[PDB]
Amino acid sequence: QNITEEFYQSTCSAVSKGYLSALRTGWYTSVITIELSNIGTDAKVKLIKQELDKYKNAVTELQLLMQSTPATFLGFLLGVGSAIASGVAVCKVLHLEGEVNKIKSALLSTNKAVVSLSNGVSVLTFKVLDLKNYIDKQLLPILNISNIETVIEFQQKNNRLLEITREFSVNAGVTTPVSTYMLTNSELLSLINDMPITNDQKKLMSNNVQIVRQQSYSIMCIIKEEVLAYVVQLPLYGVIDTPCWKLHTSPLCTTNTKEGSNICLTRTDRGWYCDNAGSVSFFPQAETCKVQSNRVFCDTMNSLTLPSEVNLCNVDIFNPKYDCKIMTSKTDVSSSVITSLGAIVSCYGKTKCTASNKNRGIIKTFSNGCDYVSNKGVDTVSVGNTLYYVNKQEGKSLYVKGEPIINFYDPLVFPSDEFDASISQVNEKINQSLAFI
Amino acid sequence: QNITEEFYQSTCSAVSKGYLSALRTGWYTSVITIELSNIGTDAKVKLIKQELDKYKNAVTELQLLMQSTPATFLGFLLGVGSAIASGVAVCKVLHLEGEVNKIKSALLSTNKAVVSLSNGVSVLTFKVLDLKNYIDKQLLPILNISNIETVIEFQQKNNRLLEITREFSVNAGVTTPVSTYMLTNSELLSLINDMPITNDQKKLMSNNVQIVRQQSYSIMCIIKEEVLAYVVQLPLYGVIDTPCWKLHTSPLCTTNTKEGSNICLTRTDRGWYCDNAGSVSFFPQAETCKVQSNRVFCDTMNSLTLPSEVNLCNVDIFNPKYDCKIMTSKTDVSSSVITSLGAIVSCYGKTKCTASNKNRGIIKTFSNGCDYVSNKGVDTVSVGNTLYYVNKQEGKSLYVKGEPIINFYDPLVFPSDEFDASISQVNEKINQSLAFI
Amino acid sequence: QNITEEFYQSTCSAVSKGYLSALRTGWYTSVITIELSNIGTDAKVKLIKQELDKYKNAVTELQLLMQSTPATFLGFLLGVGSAIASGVAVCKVLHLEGEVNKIKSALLSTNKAVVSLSNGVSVLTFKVLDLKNYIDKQLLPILNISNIETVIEFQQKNNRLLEITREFSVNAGVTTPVSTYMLTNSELLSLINDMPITNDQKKLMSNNVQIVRQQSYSIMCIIKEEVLAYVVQLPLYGVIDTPCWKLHTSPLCTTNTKEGSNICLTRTDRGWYCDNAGSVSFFPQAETCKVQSNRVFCDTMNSLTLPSEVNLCNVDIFNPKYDCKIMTSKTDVSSSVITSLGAIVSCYGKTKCTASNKNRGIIKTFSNGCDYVSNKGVDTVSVGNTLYYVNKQEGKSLYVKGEPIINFYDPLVFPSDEFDASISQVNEKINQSLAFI
C-alpha cells in the first residue's frame, strides 16, 4: 500500500504509517507422525545394513532424548510467557494409555485426519512418512538379492528421519523456525488449508509460509508403538488488517558550545504499534516484528496493551490524556536512525553529519541538533565514522516543523539520568527542586 | 519430583521449588581427530574424482580457516568470562613440535586413548574417522576399474568431513552446540563413559546428552601430518542434586483512580537460585538455565554467588539480614508472568485481565493490583490483547496472603525511577527528602 | 603482534593494546545466479523423476517466498541502521523490465561478469550453477534409457539448489552468515579477487574468509526468465591496520565492614576502541567485534564516533578534556572480568576470591576490593562459586598502582543508582546536595 512518514522536529521522532497487521494471538497444535518399523555380505547389502543402522540409531537417539518433559527501550516492561506451553500440554496428552493408538488407527487409511483427544482437544494429525511400510515391504524381503536402486531410494527416504533427529539433537527436542524436514512446503500448505480458520487466514498464511515457519515450534513428543510423533505449534492470527505504524525516536539535545552543559531527552516509546480491539498493541522491541511489504507480523506475547491515547504523543507530546514516556541524560553523542522512508540525524559536538546521493556525493550537511531527511534523492547518511544506507522503498515523507521541546527546560533544574520517566514525572521533579531554589 | 509453588501477595512474586541442580562448574577438553590422506575417464570414476575434489577443497578450506588463533533484570551485574579459554589453551599445545605425532601414535592401534600433553594436560583422544585408511586402500588402487557401490560408500564416508567443514566455515572455527557431525551420539556417550568423573556424572550426562551438546564447544584446532584435530570442550557438573528454586516477580503498583498518581515497585532479584557450597548461585537471566523435568542445568559463568540469606526476601522482604533488591517507577502497565505452576497478573488501569479454562471460558476476572492463579483448572490467562498459556505440569500452589508493600509508601516522597535499588536504599532516600519537608 | 595490557587500580579497569583494525565501513553487492530449466517407469527413471520433482518444488517454493520485498553497557546509545538496505535496493533494480535479461546475456559465455545496472550500479555477476544446461542436455533426452551414474550426478547437482532453498525457507529469504551453499570457498575467493578493492583488502579478506562470511548477507531476489538470482552483500573494510584497544571495566566499591554502607562506581565505557579518521570508533558491545590473532573485525554500524580524548579516561579519569562515563550504585557484588592477558577481580563481602595454577592450585587470595592478576603462571581465577579460565595468549601486563577513586567520595552525599552518568555529573549532584547540608 501507500507507506507514508512524518518527522516531528519538536521531539526528534518519526512515524511510518500505512502498514497492515498480522498479529499472532494464539496457537494451533498439530501432531505430525512418522510410522516406524520394528525389525558373507554383498556390497549392495552392506550399504543397506549401514543405512539401517543409521535408522535404529536415530530411533534410540530420539527415545533417549525424550526422557524429559520438553521445555525451552521498554522491553523490560513486558510480561513473561511460556511459548510452547500449549504444545507441551498436547504432548503430555499423547503419553496417556492407548492415546497413541487412537492416532495410529485414525491414519490407517489416510495421511491427514482430525482426532479428538481424551481431554477434548481437537488436533489435526498428519502421517508424513511411512517408513514402516517401506522397510517391511521392500527391505525385509532382502534381509530375511540386492540392486543399487533401492540403496539409493532407502537413503532418500531415511534421510528425512536422520535430519529431523539432527535438529532435535542440537535443540533439546524443541525447534524454531520449523524446517522443511519437519514439515515440507506442500505439507504445511495443505496443513494450513485443513486448518479451522478463515479464508482470510488461510490466504495470509499460504502467501507468507516463510513467516509462519519462523513463528512456529516443533516439539519432539513421543515414540511408542511404531509411531514417531512430534507436535507442530502453528501461529493463529486473530488480528489481521488493522492499521499499524512504526515509531522511530532519537536523542534530542541542546547544542550549547560549552561541553557538558547540554541536556538531552529521548522518547522511549519507540517500536511498532497496531490497533487491536479498541486498544493499541505496542511492541517495544521492533526486532520482534517481521515486515513483508506493508504487512507487519508480530507476536502479542512481546507487546503491551496500551490506551489508544498513546498515539497523541506524536502530534502533542504535552497532551493531557496520556503521559508520554521519555528518558533524560546529558550524553549528547551523535547517531542516526534509519526510518522506513528517510533518516533521523542526531548530530552533536564536533561530529560530521551529512546525507549523500550515489552519483553526486554530499547534498546536505546537518548542523548540531536533531534533523531528518527523506529517502527521495538520498542514498546514504553519514554520522561520524558510520555510513548508513537508507531504505529505498517509495512513499511520501512530511517534515513537521516545531521547536525542539528540550529548549523549554532550564538546564540548572533539569533532571538528567532518568530512564523510565515521562513528561509529567520530569515536571514534578523540576517543580520540587524549584521549590527549594 | 514434587514441584511446589508459593505466591506472595505482599511483593507480587512467586517461588517454584522442588528442583535439582546440575551446574556446569568446569570444562573437560577432548581432542577429536580424523586421519587424512595425502594423495578418458569412466562415468563411475568421474564421480569418484568429483568427490575427491570435495575432499581436498575441504582440507585446504580448513587449513585456510586456521591461520588465526580461535576466538569467540540483574544480568548487568555479571562478570565476564572467556568460555573457550581452556580449549584454546589445549589447542595452543597441539601446535608444539611433534605434539601432534604423540596423538598420531597413541591412536595407531586404538580409536580411544588418553594422552599426557607436554605441559601436563591429560586429555582423552578420539579417532572418529580414518579417511587415510579408506582412501589409500580402496580409492588409490583405482586411480593408480570402478563400481557404483564404492562411489556411494565414498560419498557417505566423505560426507562427515564435508559437514564438519561447513559448520566451521559459518562459525569461524568454533561451534556450539556440538552437532552429531562433530561427535555422534554413540561417540559422545562412549566419550562420557571414559571420562574421569563420578558414576553420578556419567549417568546424568548420558541421560541428558542433548543438554551436554548445548553446553559444549567444538574448536577447530590443527591440520598437520595427515591429522585433522579439533578440541571438544565438554561441561563438568561439579554441583549436582542440590535444591534449586525459580523466583518470578512482577510489578506491584498502587491502584488509585487519578492516573499518574500511582507508584510502582518490582523485585529485581528474579531468576534461578541453587544452593551451592554454603552460598546461593543466582542466575539473573533464567534464559541461561535449561529445565529437564525437575533437573535444572545452569552455567555458573552466568551466576552471582550470593549469601544464602537472599532467600529471606521471599518470606520477609523487610528482613534485617539481606537488603532485598527492588526497582521503583510510576509506570503502571499491565502484564502477566507465567510461573511453573500458575500465573502472576499485574493488572492496572483499564486493562481486561482474566483467567480461562479450555471448556468453559472465563472463570476469574482480576481486579486492579497484583494477583495470581494456579494452573489447576486454568488453561489460559489474558492481560489486555495478550493470551498466555499456563504450564500444565502438576504440583501444588500455595497463595500466601499479605498486604502489598507498596501501600506502606507515601507517594509524595516515594523515589520513583530507581533501577538498581533495594529496600534500605529506598528508605534512606525517603528519610532524606522527608528531612527537608 | 605484541599484545600488551595495563591495569588501573584506581578505576578497576584494564586496557589491552597492540591490535589492528578491520572495520566494515560499507557494502559491496554482487548478484549470484543459477540458470534454471523450463521442462510404466523404470527403477532408475523413477528416482530421476523424484529428483526432478524436488527441483520444481524448490523453484515454486522460491517463487512463493519472493511475493514480498525482502526485509530483516552503552549499547543503548547506538543509532539504528538498516543492514540490507543496499542489497534490497539492488534487488529492487533487478525487478525492472529486461533488467534480468541484461545479466542473462552478460553471462552467456562467461560465469563472472560485471554489469552496469539501469540506475548506474556497477555490480559483479556470477553464474555459479547452470542447471539449465544439465537438465536440457542430459536429463531431457531420457524423458522425451537410464543409468545409475546420472541419478547420482543429478542428485549432486540438484543438492545445491535444494540447500539454498532450505536456508531461504527458514530465514525468510535473508541469510547471514553466507553459507558455502550460497557461495563456495573458491567462488567467494574468486569473487573477492575480482572485487574493486586494494590488494590490502583482497589479502585481508582472502585470509579471513570465515569472518567475511559472518559479516555478509544473502538476499533472495528474483526468479524470472529461467534465472534464479540472489544478492550477496559483502563487507567493505575501509579502515584497516589502525590501532585498536579493548577496555575492560569492573565495579569498584568501598570495603567497609557494616553491610549496605558501601558505595560503588563502574566505568561504563567498556568495549572496543579503534583509531579511525581522526576520531575513535567505540564499540560498546564488544560481542560485535571478532578477534583473529591481533586483527579486530568490527562493524561501524555498532559504533559511536567519539573524540580521541576519550582515551584520557584510562590514564586520568579526572582529566579536564573528556567527561568520563561511570555508573554508581551500592550493589557490592563480587565478580571477575577475564581480560586479554589477565583477570580483574572485584571481590566484596564474604566471597572467596583466588587465582590458581593448574599444577599447584591456589597461588593468590584476593582481599576485598578491585584487583588484578596477569595470565603468566595463572590458569584459573575463582570468584565465589564461579571458575573462570584465563586466556593463555602471551603478552606483558603492567600493574599501574593508584588509589581507588571511590575513596574520594563521602558516602553520605554520594549519588548512587546513576547509570548514564559521568565524573562531572556526579560532581554536580554532590555539590547540590552539599549545598543543602
Ligand SMILES: O=c1n(Cc2nc3nc(Cl)ccc3n2CCCC(F)(F)F)c2cnccc2n1C1CC1
Ligand atoms: O539496564 C537497565 N537499566 C539501567 C539504566 N539506567 C539508565 N539511565 C539512562 Cl538516562 C539511560 C539508560 C539507562 N539504563 C540502561 C537502559 C536499558 C536498556 F538497554 F534496556 F534500554 C534500567 C533502568 N530502568 C528500567 C530498566 C532498566 N534496565 C534493563 C532491564 C535491564
Ligand SMILES: *[C@@H]1O[C@H](CO[C@@H]2O[C@@H](C)[C@@H](O)[C@@H](O)[C@@H]2O)[C@@H](O)[C@H](O)[C@H]1NC(C)=O
Ligand atoms: C512544572 O514544571 C514545568 C517545567 O517547565 C520548565 O522547565 C524546567 C526545566 C524549568 O525551566 C522550569 O523552571 C520551567 O518552568 C512548568 O512548565 C510547569 O508550569 C510546572 N507546573 C506547576 C503546576 O508548577
Ligand SMILES: *[C@@H]1O[C@H](CO[C@@H]2O[C@@H](C)[C@@H](O)[C@@H](O)[C@@H]2O)[C@@H](O)[C@H](O)[C@H]1NC(C)=O
Ligand atoms: C525510613 O523511611 C521509612 C519509610 O516508610 C514510609 O514510606 C515513605 C514512602 C513515607 O511514607 C515515609 O514517610 C514512611 O515512613 C520509615 O518507615 C522508616 O522508619 C525510616 N527510618 C528511619 C530510621 O527514620
Ligand SMILES: *[C@@H]1O[C@H](CO[C@@H]2O[C@@H](C)[C@@H](O)[C@@H](O)[C@@H]2O)[C@@H](O)[C@H](O)[C@H]1NC(C)=O
Ligand atoms: C564538586 O564536588 C566534588 C566532590 O568531591 C568529594 O566527593 C563527594 C562525594 C563529597 O565527599 C564531597 O564533599 C567531596 O568534595 C569536589 O571535589 C569538587 O571540588 C566540587 N566542585 C566545586 C566547584 O565545588
Ligand SMILES: [Cl-]
Ligand atoms: Cl547500511
Ligand SMILES: [Cl-]
Ligand atoms: Cl502461549
Ligand SMILES: [Cl-]
Ligand atoms: Cl571458563
